[PDB]
Amino acid sequence: SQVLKIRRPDDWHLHLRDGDMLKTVVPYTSEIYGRAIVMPNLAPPVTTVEAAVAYRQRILDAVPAGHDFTPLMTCYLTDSLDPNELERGFNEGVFTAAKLYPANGVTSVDAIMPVLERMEKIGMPLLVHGEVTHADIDIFDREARFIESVMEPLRQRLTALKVVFEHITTKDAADYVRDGNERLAATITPQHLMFNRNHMLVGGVRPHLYCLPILKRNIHQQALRELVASGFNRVFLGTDSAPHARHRKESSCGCAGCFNAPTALGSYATVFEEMNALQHFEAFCSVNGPQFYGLPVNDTFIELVREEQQVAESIALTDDTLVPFLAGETVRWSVK
Amino acid sequence: SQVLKIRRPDDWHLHLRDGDMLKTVVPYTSEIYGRAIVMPNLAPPVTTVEAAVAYRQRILDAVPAGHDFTPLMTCYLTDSLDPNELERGFNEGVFTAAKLYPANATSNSSHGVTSVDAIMPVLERMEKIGMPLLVHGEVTHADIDIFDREARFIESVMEPLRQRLTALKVVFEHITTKDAADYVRDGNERLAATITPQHLMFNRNHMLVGGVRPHLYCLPILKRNIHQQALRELVASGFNRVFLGTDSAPHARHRKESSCGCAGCFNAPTALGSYATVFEEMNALQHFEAFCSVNGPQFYGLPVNDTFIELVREEQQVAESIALTDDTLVPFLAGETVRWSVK
Numbered sequence: 158s159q160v161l162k163i164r165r166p167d168d169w170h171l172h173l174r175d176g177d178m179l180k181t182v183v184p185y186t187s188e189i190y191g192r193a194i195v196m197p198n199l200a201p202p203v204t205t206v207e208a209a210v211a212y213r214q215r216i217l218d219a220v221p222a223g224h225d226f227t228p229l230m231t232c233y234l235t236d237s238l239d240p241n242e243l244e245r246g247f248n249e250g251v252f253t254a255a256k257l258y259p260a261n262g263v264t265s266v267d268a269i270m271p272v273l274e275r276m277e278k279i280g281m282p283l284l285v286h287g288e289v290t291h292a293d294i295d296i297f298d299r300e301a302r303f304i305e306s307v308m309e310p311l312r313q314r315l316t317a318l319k320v321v322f323e324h325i326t327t328k329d330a331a332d333y334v335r336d337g338n339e340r341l342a343a344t345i346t347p348q349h350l351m352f353n354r355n356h357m358l359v360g361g362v363r364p365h366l367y368c369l370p371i372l373k374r375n376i377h378q379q380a381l382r383e384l385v386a387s388g389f390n391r392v393f394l395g396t397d398s399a400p401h402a403r404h405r406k407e408s409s410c411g412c413a414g415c416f417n418a419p420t421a422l423g424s425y426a427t428v429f430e431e432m433n434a435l436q437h438f439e440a441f442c443s444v445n446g447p448q449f450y451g452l453p454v455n456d457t458f459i460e461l462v463r464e465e466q467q468v469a470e471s472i473a474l475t476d477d478t479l480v481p482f483l484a485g486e487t488v489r490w491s492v493k
Numbered sequence: 494s495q496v497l498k499i500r501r502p503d504d505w506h507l508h509l510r511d512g513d514m515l516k517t518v519v520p521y522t523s524e525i526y527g528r529a530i531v532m533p534n535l536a537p538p539v540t541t542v543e544a545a546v547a548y549r550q551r552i553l554d555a556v557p558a559g560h561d562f563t564p565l566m567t568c569y570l571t572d573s574l575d576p577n578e579l580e581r582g583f584n585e586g587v588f589t590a591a592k593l594y595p596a597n598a599t600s601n602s603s604h605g606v607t608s609v610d611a612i613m614p615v616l617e618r619m620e621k622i623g624m625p626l627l628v629h630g631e632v633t634h635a636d637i638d639i640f641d642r643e644a645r646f647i648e649s650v651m652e653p654l655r656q657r658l659t660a661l662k663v664v665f666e667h668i669t670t671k672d673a674a675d676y677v678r679d680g681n682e683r684l685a686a687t688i689t690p691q692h693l694m695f696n697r698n699h700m701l702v703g704g705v706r707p708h709l710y711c712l713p714i715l716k717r718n719i720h721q722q723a724l725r726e727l728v729a730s731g732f733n734r735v736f737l738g739t740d741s742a743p744h745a746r747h748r749k750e751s752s753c754g755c756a757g758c759f760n761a762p763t764a765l766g767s768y769a770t771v772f773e774e775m776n777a778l779q780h781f782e783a784f785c786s787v788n789g790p791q792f793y794g795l796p797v798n799d800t801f802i803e804l805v806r807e808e809q810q811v812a813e814s815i816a817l818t819d820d821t822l823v824p825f826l827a828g829e830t831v832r833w834s835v836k
């Protein structure tokens with residue numbers, strides 16, 4: 158019965174893959190979101206303007222006629238990337254931002270200072286997967302350790318640099334972001350709002366809930382839920398929809414990533430509704446991101462209805478299937 | 494190449510399953526171990542003397558010609574279990590011990606325990622007759638973080654139980670935490686523990702970094718490195734109320750590598766050499782025989798084995814998988830090169 162009309166959303170953190178997987182997955186995004194930040198971690202990664210232009214065209218080839226969807230491309234930062242290449246792509250409208258992945262990506266921030274300094278000067282946002290990767294650091298501590306040892310030093314060095322702390326998963330990061338300045342923002346996925354590590358590990362191991370940064374303790378989940386529900390205007394929708402074929406997930410060494418594009422928007426609506434915070438929902442989906450990136454808000458509107466839809470058990474691929482996040486379950490809100 | 498000769502070991506915590514899976518897995522135990530504690534979590538559970546007798550015989554049927562292997566059977570504790578049934582099984586040599594799995598208010602009375610308070614008549618009987626209680630010590634309340642469940646058990650159940658029943662003999666099965674290590678270390682002669690090879694060799698990072706590894710997924714869940722190190726130090730100290738219990742817990746490959754993978758490591762094929770590797774790395778090989786072959790017997794009041802086996806420090810590759818009638822079994826350390834093997 159209940160209907161919720163919002164400004165059309167965007168997705169500020171998306172993996173579209175390539176090839177036949179890209180053809181399969183893009184329509185789940187393009188049918189809903191006006192734009193999406195398309196991450197650059199292809200094999201090999203998108204590190205040149207030329208590669209980004211080609212990738213962008215493959216994505217557009219795969220967008221059904223009638224979907225008004227614009228992929229916003231990103232550069233994968235590498236220790237050796239030429240700052241002139243990053244800037245050229247930016248000037249051309251090809252690169253919207255650059256993405257910093259930990260080594261096991263970038264080995265040190267120090268190795269890429271010239272690039273980061275260029276980004277700071279030209280006003281290019283830096284998107285950060287914020288985890289340290291030393292073998293001795295427990296996997297649940299890697300996000301927290303990143304804040305102290307990399308993020309805060311980096312932001313102290315480049316005080317004009319705009320940073321998105323991508324897919325934050327901890328109370329540590331939530332507090333860090335809440336207390337930061339207008340040059341620091343974050344994205345949060347649906348899974349890190351809806352679940353905690355118990356949902357991945359109790360009663361069985363659930364690889365479809367296995368993603369990076371790893372699901373944390375409930376106290377962390379609660380901190381993220383309170384953050385979005387507070388109305389804080391520098392957090393915004395980024396799904397980290399990260400699809401893998403079923404048997405790449407269900408194997409002796411399962412790939413990280415949740416394929417949440419089909420269910421994310423309604424999943425977010427449920428969280429906000431639960432937190433008694435639907436008045437902040439549009440801003441999270443459709444306003445906060447644009448503001449941070451200095452892009453206009455979308456000028457169309459969509460509707461969500463609170464009618465329970467059943468999530469497909471699987472989606473066909475050329476070879477194998479794709480298991481969506483919440484496969485076989487129910488979502489309380491769906492797109493009208 | 495170096496040789497380690499020990500009295501024939503026993504496995505104080507084992508899952509043998511049933512049917513065809515039992516036929517496949519028993520030889521990996523019977524070739525090496527003189528005795529094993531056979532856990533009772535079949536579907537349906539072993540909760541009667543008659544079922545334990547028939548199960549013991551199915552196990553015996555699957556032992557290869559010439560292996561000298563004796564299964565020591567256990568009773569699954571449930572709300573509806575009659576203390577007279579348990580006592581009779583004990584008195585007749587059928588039940589060596591009884592096994593308490595985590596309580597759950599939704600448990601069918603035929604299949605489990607709703608709360609420990611609700612099975613005090615049976616626990617009092619075990620105390621009275623000197624039957625050892627084997628405890629899977631986790632609390633499973635939905636609002637407890639899975640990594641916290643063992644420590645919460647110590648506080649909520651273990652300590653109060655042992656204060657209530659001061660003569661009760663308890664083995665804290667497959668301990669995984671420094672909490673449990675210290676607790677057991679500081680206990681009396683009526684408290685012991687078993688430790689698996691996976692909890693000595695690995696921590697949760699091994700299960701979750703670079704990929705999710707369901708063949709390392711087991712209960713109680715792998716913990717953070719500080720806990721793994723405490724376990725290692727406990728065994729390496731020569732503490733004589735910790736002993737070998739593999740928790741070898743086989744599931745078909747398709748049941749492990751699924752959207753909801755089953756908990757358990759099939760480590761019977763590789764456990765003993767893994768334990769040897771750990772003791773060696775801890776410079777504690779002088780304590781290795783006792784852990785494998787003496788401490789368990791002393792705790793249970795049974796004789797130490799009088800035959801010997803040899804481990805050799807020569808590298809071998811572990812099978813990638815082991816055929817079942819349908820599907821396959823992936824062993825602990827599948828495909829890896831291991832340092833010690835049985836001669």
Ligand SMILES: NC(=O)N[C@@H](CC(=O)O)C(=O)O
Pocket residue numbers: 172198286367368369370397399400413414415
């Ligand atoms: N997060 C994930 O679990 N997966 C992402 C990578 C990423 O965002 O690190 C992927 O590309 O597979």
Ligand SMILES: O=C1C[C@@H](C(=O)O)NC(=O)N1
Pocket residue numbers: 508534629710711712713740742743756757758
């Ligand atoms: O408690 C248990 C049960 C066992 C099994 O599979 O039977 N597997 C485990 O991982 N631990």
Ligand SMILES: [Zn+2]
Pocket residue numbers: 286323324369370
């Ligand atoms: Zn990431």
Ligand SMILES: [Zn+2]
Pocket residue numbers: 170171172196397399
């Ligand atoms: Zn991502």
Ligand SMILES: [Zn+2]
Pocket residue numbers: 629666667712713
């Ligand atoms: Zn157990």
Ligand SMILES: [Zn+2]
Pocket residue numbers: 506507508532740742
């Ligand atoms: Zn067990």
